[PDB]
Structure formats: C-alpha cells, structure tokens
Amino acid sequence: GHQPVAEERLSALLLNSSEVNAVMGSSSMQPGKPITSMDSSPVTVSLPDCQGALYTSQDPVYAGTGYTAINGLISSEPGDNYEHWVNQAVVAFPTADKARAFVQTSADKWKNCAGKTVTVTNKAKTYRWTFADVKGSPPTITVIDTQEGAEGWECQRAMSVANNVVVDVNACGYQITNQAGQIAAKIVDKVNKE
Template sequence: MSGGHNAWVSLTDHPVTVLANRCVGAVAAVLVASVLLTGCVHSVQGTATRQSPGQGVPVDVPPLDEADLDAVLLTIGELNGIMGATQMKVTSELDQMTDHSAKVSDPDCLGAVYGAEEPVYAGTGWTAVRDQVAREPTDDNDHWVEQTAVLYPAAENAQEFFDKSAAIWADCANNAIGVGDGDYLWALEDLQMDDTMITQTANQEGADGWGCQHAVTLVANLTVEAWACGYRITDEAAEIATAMIDNVPRK
C-alpha cells in the first residue's frame, strides 16, 4: 500500500499500530475552529527553546488522581466537530502503555512518531493512562484521532516529560522516519512550541498529502497528548489538547 489513506485496512485498531502506518507512526497518535494556543509560538530546529509563557493553561488546578482522567477525554461529538467530520467513532480504548520501539527506523525518535509508549514515558514515574482512538468505521476513513491523558505523582514529573518531549521532537525534526518494515516513511517538520504546548506536523511520503499533527501540553500533574490525521490538517491536535486541558476538574 503506497498511501496512508488505505494503510489501515489490514491493521488492528490499536492506536500505535494504526498510526505507525498512517500517522507518522504515532499510536498513533489537528482545525475547523481557530487553534486555542496563546503566547509566542515559533519553529525550533535542533535544540528546543522557549519564548513567552503560554496563557491558555489554568493555574488553579490542584493535584489530580486517576478518577479524574476519564473526564479529561473529549466526547466523540467534540472530536468530530474539531475534525470537521460526522462519522468518526471510538474504535480503541486503553489504560496501559505499549512498546513499538522495534517498529521505527530510529528508536530515539519513538516519542515523536508514536503516542502512549512505555519507553517514552519510562522514568517519569507515571501512575495511570487513558488512551483513546477515534476514526470512521470504514476502511477508507478520512480522519484519525488519538487522545492520551497521563497522570504523574507530582507536577514536576509532568514538566519533566514535557521538556524531554520537546528535546526529542526537536532532535528528530527534518528527518524521515521509517515505520514497520520500512514501507512507510514519515517526514517530520520543525517543532513548534511555547511554555505550555509543543506541536509537530508529519507527512507520510507517497500518500497524496495524508498527514498528522502531534501535540503535547500539561497542567498540574497531568500531560495530554493528541494526534489528528487527515488530508488537510492544520492545528487540530493543538485544539484537541487544549480542549482536554479545559476539561480538567478544578475541584
């Protein structure tokens, strides 16, 4: 299969397995409305740097626990609205990490091309995860979304993961990463970031414009990770991630 649009046909619906072939290899795993990012966002090459602090992340959030995670995920109606879709359905739900490091040509870039990966979160002390994939139920699905919420013992752990992700994504920018048996190549673009959000776009080579945006943001002792994939992707993953943070219980 030469294009990402049909690359899902023979795959399971596990987020990492699916995205490995269609969406930059993310467990993937994006803008009908304007992106909700604030602050000065800029391209980063090589080493991740920051400009002015973001303004969209709430500061009045106490430490969260596992019971809060399900409330963070967006509904299928919200996901369809952001993606400009009407037929997406939830096709996968997980409460554990996976490991697809053997499926990428550069394991150091695993965090830039897959989501909810055990090796990527190793050492952060994470305590719970919710991972969900949504797409059209047909083989030729035009949209693919993954949303992941990860809980840590303290805010410092969430910040550590955010900073580590920024450095990895920046190092992997402007590279083509092979996924699976090398049949799929994903071209990673420059990292975009401010103090509270990092995003990166990737396009599958030879797939007629199929691409994905990947986003990570954080609040308190929580990080959220989003993938949004399709043929005309802009900032939908950033919008999904921001909306997930808006769902965080204030208690």
C-alpha cells in the first residue's frame, strides 16, 4: 500500500482524550472544537522565522508550502490555570515529497532559533521565550522553549512526517521532557496504519 492519507481522514490521526491525558500525566484534560484552518491571528516574534518554532499550525509558516488540509485540537484541564496544554495537528500534502520538504524547511528555521531568547508580542502583551537545542532523530525534530519568570512553564515542540502527512505538536506544562515527542510518535503510528 502506497496510497496517501485522504484529507477526510486527518481527524482520525489525532490522539483521543485518554491518549492525551496519559502522555501528559493528567486525568482531566478536555479538547476544544476541531481546528480546521491555519492560525492567522497576528503575532510578532523578534526573530520572525522563529514563529514556527514556537507554535503549530501558523499561517505565515505554512503559506506557500502546498498543504491541502489541516486538522487539530487544543486540550487542557478546565479553568484558567491548567497544569497541562496540548496543541496537536496533522497537515496533509499532495505527496510525501512536499510533506518532507516542509519538515526539512522547519528544521532549518528551528536550528537558527536554538539557544536563543526571543520576544513575542500577542494581544498587546509581550513575553520572552528561550529555546534549547533542536533534538530528535530523522525525520522528527523537537525543541523545548521556556517562558521567562519563576513559574517554570515550558513547551516542547515536535514535528514529524509520515506518508504525505506532517505532524505538528506543542505540549506545555511545568514538567516537560519529551511529551510532544511522544505525542508525535503516537500520531505517526496512526498514519502508518491508515
């Protein structure tokens, strides 16, 4: 079987509520409404090409890449002070080649963000985030970013590709090590079984 994943099957690739909870160490995370388009809400990053290194599914990042469809979910415990937060998305491309090219581009951009602090402005609010080094083994990339302050809030970004599908994950919390890497690998397993 060498057929690509159909656009209409993207939602079946995401992790369910049990799976998200299990990775994150929670029993109460809940998903929001399906996300079915790229995010074009404005955000300013002091190094503009680090936008994708901070957030999944960003319009300025995916624009022009040939993607055909995106399906995602954001999950967290209820309330304003959730312990865990996950944004998981899968992005369909016409071919494996185009999907892989996008991850390669992402790897180039993330490597220029590694080991740097950037300033991010959103809704007239400004915060600084510090990137660790880019990790992972082909075709997966990961990087941990840490929000300034004594909270210790952090996010791990993970991106991978299988078949014609790019897997794009942001997992955040106070005890981040490789949750986004785990999520990505589980989504890749779902792509593989399509």
